[PDB]
């Protein structure tokens, strides 16, 4: 199903972006 793979890809991206943002906070700020 296309709606499920779209959600799973978002969940993976959302989890990565959250850790990526904190990484930017520790290194840039």
Ligand X SMILES: CCCCCCCC/C=C/CCCCCCCC(=O)OC[C@@H](O)CO
- Which residues of this chain interact with ligand X, rule CB under 6 A? 3-4, 7, 13, 16-17, 19-20, 23
Work out whether 23 is an interface residue with a second copy (CB under 8 A). Answer: no
Least separation, in Å, of the C-beta of 9 and ligand X?
9
- Give the C-alpha separation, 23 to 29, whole Å: 10
Provide the 3-class DSSP secondary structure of residue 6: helix
1-20 positions binding a second copy, by CB under 8 A: 2-4, 6-19
* Token pair for 24: 């930017």
Query: How many residues in the shown chain lie near a second copy by CB under 8 A?
Result: 18
């Amino acid at each position: 199903p296309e709606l499920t793979v779209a959600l799973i890809l978002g969940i993976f991206l959302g989890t990565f972006i959250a850790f990526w943002v904190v990484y930017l906070l520790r290194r840039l700020c």
